[PDB]
Symmetry: none
């Protein structure tokens, strides 16, 4: 099912070691074996349905394109990147049907690596479609992070969208860069919302831990006061950190 | 007087009852009564000079336009929207002759409702003018808020400026949408100025309440210090709320 | 050498006073003497290498152009402005070879005045080059401030870049005005970086001056606690100041 895949792992390890010796056709052999094996993983993983195989098959196909560039075959690298897109988009199908956010995050990281590699390879049309699929995954993290409400997927999706925009700036697509930056701003703004909501909580904590304890000048009361005072400063510092990332997200629209 | 208002309220009901019944000529008649009744309420209010009747006549004329749609009479709804602007502008005049900013605020809220209704109606030219008279009112709230110096009229005028922008986008008008967003950033910035100037005050309060009282570790001195520390934290929260509104006002330029 | 400067200072003063008398040719002569004397101050300063003589000769040539406009010779003013550019750009070469930031700042101010003067003069070509050289000086204050890390050369360069943008708007170059405003946002963001980092310092100070002294409620301990609490509020106000400058710097892109 999936242990026959370890042939692709070993054939890639042999490709880089036969490069240093000076054998061009024996190094292209270990690269071509990986390309044909990774091709079969596209259909072997469709039977097993495992997301991990599609991930590791995509990571191998990206490193094959990175090797095929140093070998001198921009056509082996073109196919290797085109085969990475087919694998990433299949994770996009399995991550919508399984609804897992973890796969959506690692699949978005793959689509970013596919885009950066495809320009050093020489296939910008597939790279633009790699950035388009990357924003599609980040926009699906938007939909799920606003449903689960987790302040961790909002942060990760905001980090990914800014990498998608920086990639799209390396691409030559300011349309995708400005789409990705806007997506980053809509996320980091709702991070400011939930972070300011936490300041509204600690404020009223620093109002009931006081207006009842302003009459009692106890030693333990005053120290309890000093404990809530700094636990409010600890949280207002983070909003000044989150608001700074908005001013950095807003500035990358320039 | 007061009864011709409830007469219009009953005829609007009869218009909606006769639509479920099926009578088209009698639903049009009940709408026709409403427009002629609301017209008389305009004439009567222009002679009594009451801001209440002008507001209750505008809110009737708006809902007459909403009913004149479902009846299938966009001409009756065009006139209904036109008559709402005639009433909103007559609130602009009595707000300058009575110097009341509360009439201005309630007149701008009406000018916004007229704009949203006039597209569902189908008279965008009167809707664009409803948005234009809505910015004329926000910009009068600028003048008077910069005269009375209230940090609340600036907030309402800024919220109105944003709502004028969101309407102007539903309108189409990207000129008014950008006018209303540049007017919004004008206000939300001067809110940060008047709010940071209040931090500079309480900072120097937390510096004279210490440099003298760092030597005296009294029970009343230390409790005095803890009272100014949180009254400063109460104020820095407001700047992190106003600066957050700036970042939302700036993000709507994208 | 440097005593011929005071001769030019008297000849410039003789021009405006002979304008009040009514002598047009003797006012043109006093301007012609100044332009020839300042020219000699340029040739002498290029051999002595003194930065102060290049500055004083530039400030004279600028006021020579200001007087040459009142007298009525826009050709003497075109030369006086071009000669000011020759002096500032030579300070740009000496300030890169000596690395002094004090010269870079005053030379950027000189270039700003050269631009504002040349439009009253009538040579917009030289004025636009005066603003280009101003941004070059400001962007060289970027390179030196990001090496020494001084949070104050970042402040001065940010104010210069904003003045260059104000000039460029008076120029008619929104290209430069947007270049200068993006240069300002680059600086005020790194001011936020090094100000939030100073806030990460005092956070962990308000954690180690507490979580060990939470158990020890001494009169000297709690006063030392209050000292660090306000020294944190001292710094978090400076971030809300700087972050407000980022929101004003970003709003100028509208």
């Amino acid at each position: 099912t999936e242990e026959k895949i370890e042939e692709a792992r070993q054939s890639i390890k042999e490709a880089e070691r036969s490069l240093r010796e000076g054998n061009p056709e024996k190094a292209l052999d270990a690269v071509a074996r990986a390309l044909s094996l990774v091709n079969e993983l596209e259909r072997l993983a469709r039977k097993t349905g495992s997301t991990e195989v599609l991930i590791e098959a995509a990571r191998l196909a990206i490193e094959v394109a990175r090797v095929a560039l140093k070998v001198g075959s921009p056509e082996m690298a073109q196919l290797a990147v085109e085969l990475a897109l087919r694998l990433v988009q299949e994770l996009e199908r399995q991550a919508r049907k399984t609804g897992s956010t973890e796969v959506l995050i690692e699949a978005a990281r793959l689509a970013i690596e596919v885009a950066r590699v495809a320009f050093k390879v020489g296939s910008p049309e597939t790279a633009r479609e790699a950035a388009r699929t990357a924003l599609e995954l980040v926009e699906e993290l938007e939909r799920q992070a606003r449903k689960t409400g987790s302040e961790e997927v909002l942060e990760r999706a905001a980090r990914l969208a800014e990498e998608v925009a920086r990639v799209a700036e390396e691409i030559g697509d300011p349309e995708l860069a400005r789409k990705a930056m806007k997506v980053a701003i809509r996320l980091t703004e709702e991070l400011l919302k939930k972070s300011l909501r936490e300041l509204r909580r600690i404020l009223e904590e620093l109002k009931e831990m006081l207006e009842r304890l302003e009459k009692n000048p106890d030693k333990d009361v005053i120290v309890k006061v000093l404990k809530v005072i700094v636990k409010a400063i600890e949280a207002s510092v983070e909003n000044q950190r989150i608001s700074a990332d908005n001013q950095r997200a807003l500035a990358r629209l320039a």
